[PDB]
Each structure stands twice: as structure tokens, then as C-alpha cells.
Amino acid sequence: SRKKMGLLVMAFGTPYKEEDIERYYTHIRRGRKPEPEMLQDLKDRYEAIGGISPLAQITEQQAHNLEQHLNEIQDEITFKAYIGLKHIEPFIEDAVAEMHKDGITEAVSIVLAPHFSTFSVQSYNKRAKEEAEKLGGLTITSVESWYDEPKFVTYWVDRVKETYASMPEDERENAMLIVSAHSLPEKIKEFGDPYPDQLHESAKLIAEGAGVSEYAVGWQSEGNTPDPWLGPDVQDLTRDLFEQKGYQAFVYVPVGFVADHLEVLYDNDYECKVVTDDIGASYYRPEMPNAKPEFIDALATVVLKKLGR
Template structure:
């Protein structure tokens, strides 16, 4: 039986590929407003700390290709063809949609490489994709809004955090706090009952429940450089407060992210690490999902669940 061709639109934030990309990338993030020299210097300093170029671009491409490969291996109804669309750098989301149309793709499922839904994040990606597709009479796109509770995703983080806990003594565990975090967003999302905070909490509850470990909390990190209020508590502020209350070991689990990139390699591995060192506390961070089979499986399951719902088929 011939497989039904299905586009697979994988969307992500994007990152500069080289130094020359830094200013246009930062300008695009700022909605066309060029950053100051100081802002560029500060960002470049962070990239220099993690090696000059973020590994994010390479990891994202591998994730997309592995997802396509895995989907085509585990079922024989659809033939998936992957297209990568990025929010702030080429290939942009709109480029991917146009490429699908050029290649004769009539239907596609879209997934964002971020597990938790927000009107300020996932919704923007999907609106751009669907809006541009309608504009050019492109493929019908079936958007996935979130996958924060996908069992394989929960299993991955449970396994990696347990690897750390299992190496601890009983006395160290008693003074250990797991801090689950995601990228902070402007606080005004709370006015619209945005599900982002509750979804992060739900993910944390599921993972902690599997671990059977009660000392955990959620926090926010990597907030933007704007004067408005952002979601709190900030991960650094919370660490300092928890240390005052007696915790001396911290497991940072940035479950709102899926790859090694600036927000993890700098904001966690440099800033959080520096604070724990200053406090004479212990710093732990599980490895990011990147291309781990459990993570790829969680994405694939989310894609198939959406298609089964939309096409009313069983796989």
C-alpha cells in the first residue's frame, strides 16, 4: 500500500550560525530594532564563554532529521517529509512553508521544539506557519500545541535526575532541592490565564512523582532584557533563598528546553554554578535531551497522536 505523504514542520527558536549573524539575529528578536553596542558585546561574551558558536543549530537539525526517520520506521501509513522552520533566523518558518508547497505537500503536522504552550511562544510559531500557508494557498497544517506530559519526555527527565540522586548519600539527599525551570515570559501572560506556568508545574509534578522525591519546586530563568515584569521566582533568587533555609545541593532541571544552548550552557552552567560555588553548595544538572531516543520518541508520539485525531485513523 502506498504511503500518504505528510509534511513534518519542525519549528524552533534558532541561533546565530556565525559571528556575522549575531546583529541581524538580535535585531530580528527585537522586532527590527537594532541592539546597542553594549547589548551585542554582552551577548557575544556569553557565546564566547560557551565556545563561540552555540551547538543549538546542529542539534536542532539532527533532532528534526531523527524525528522524520523514526516516524517513517514505526508506522506504514504516512510518509513523513521534514521541513525545518526557525523563528529568528533562516530558514524562517515562512521559508519552510513555501518549500512544502513547492514540493507538493498538501498536509503537514507542525511541532515546536518546546514542550509547554504559551500565547507568547508556541501560539506565535503556529500562527506564523498557518497564516503564511493560508496566504500562499499552501498545505493544511495540523498544529501541536504542547507535549509537556508525553510519557517518554517524563521518562527521560526522571531517568536522568534519578542518575544524580542515586549517587547521593542519604544525608545529602535530605538537603537537596530539584529546581525545574523554563524560560521566563512577561508576567502579563497571567492576565490571560495563559497555561504556561501550570503546564511547567504539571511536568514537574509528573517527574517528581515518578522519582518519589518531594523536595522540588519550579522557577524561571533567562528573562528578557526589557523593563516589564517577568515571571518569578527567578532561578538565581530562588537558589539563594533555598540555601538560607538549609538546602546545600541543587539539581537544576531546565525542562522547558530540549537542547544544549546558550540558556543552559551559560545561564545554568555558568550563572547558577557560580552562585552555588559562592554559597558553598553543590551544583548538578542532568544532560539535556538533545537526540536521546526517548526524547525523539516523545516527539514522534505527539505527532502520531495529533494525526490520528485529525485524520481519524489508528496507528
């Protein structure tokens, strides 16, 4: 009685082992293979954050955990996950092709990044749909943003209430909450990209639901190019908020991210820690959602509401 549907889970991507990093960034660097020293730098970071192997695994887990969950909270449709990544195989265009080969004719996709942006999400979705049209007999309904999904906010609000709840009285009262997402070229502004607004909105929600009056919005992991990117970067903002109001603690909630990426384990737990430590403040960073039930559930609702279920 169930209708067979495709569940296209998309994401930036992650190398599966040390030996894939070169090609991985090249693709990110748009055909520009990293210099030997930058290459050995990248390996070290990955080596530093506990290794690469666990990284990709988190995505497979989120995909198959969302698939099974969706399949038991409703009985009308039966989903079959298909991962499509941007900078590494399986690429989006293959994920869409395999689905086809499998007789899937009706699919609903979602990108593992709560916020919308023309640079990433729109790109992923348009690519997923174009590959389809090319093949034919295959339609995809794409989610664009879910950062506002109540269950996704509740997730972050509690991790925050937990973190401030564990703070020494001393700290609780002189702490700053920094909500952030992956920085993107400023130029995205001439298209009216809502990316920056939405992130500010994720801050407002989480801070509000958590009862935190003081907070700020930042950006991070910006790439290198002539044209300006979104600021202020988390490092400067931290140090800036400190020299202006000497906070004793900073709680980093990289809401733009959904898992234990390099962007979070090194750019937040290291780079930002380096600033908190330098200025004498305590570093705090709640668990990422990863593949936890509370997250997958939220993700489910996002997918079902998209389908009117």
C-alpha cells in the first residue's frame, strides 16, 4: 500500500581517508591543487581532530537514520536514502542517476545544512533537478531551509540551557553566546540571498528559547579569494566582544553545521579555543547534532511537512 519514494540527502562532502584530501580540496579550490605545505597542513589538522575516518561516517549515519525513522513514523510512504555530495563521490548527479536506475520516480531531497543560500543549497537543488530532467521520468521536491523547524531549534536551545546550567555562577553571568555558520562571499548579497538573515534568525530563536539575553552572530571557515566574504569571522568577533565587555565565557553554537566536521572540531574547538585561552576566557561548545535521535526526528518532520504529511 506504501508508495515508494526517493530520499535524496545532500551535503558538502568529506574525504574518506587521508589519501583523498588532495583531490577533495582541489575540487573545493576549483581545480587548484593545494601546494605541498598546505597539503601537509590539512592532513595534520585532520590528524589533530581525531582523524578523518569518523567524519564521512556521520553523514552515512544521518542519511540511513533519517530513512528508517521516516519509515516508521508514517505508513503511507517507504523511503530509500540516496547520498549526493558536492565535493566528493557519490556526487549529486550520481545519487540522482542511481535513484533513476532503481525505478524511483518521485523523490524529496534535503541538504544537510539548515540555512538557505544561493551559493550552496540552491546550487545543490538545481543540480539535483537538472540531472533528473536530463534523465526524465524522475521528479524531486527539494527542501530549501529548515533552520526554523521547531524541533531543530529545541535541540540547540537545550544544549545551550545545559551548557549555561553547568557554568560556575561566576561565569553564567559574564558569558557570551556566539551563533555561527559557514562564511560565504559577500557578493551573494546582490542576489538577495537570505543566508545572512536566516542565520541571524537562528541566533534569535535559540537565544530566545534558551533565555540568553547576550549573544552575537558570527561566521567562519571562509575561503581565500580577492572578493570579501561575510564577517566578522568568529575569531575576531570573540576577541572584539572580550576587549569591549570582558566576558568570562564564550559558548560557540555553530548552528550552520550539523556534525563533527573539520569546520567545527578545528575552527571552533581549536582556533576559537586559542582565542578564549589567550584572553583567559572559558571555551564551551555543545555537542553537534550528528546522528542523535532528537536531530533525526526533527529532520523527519522537516521532510514530512514538505510533503504535506
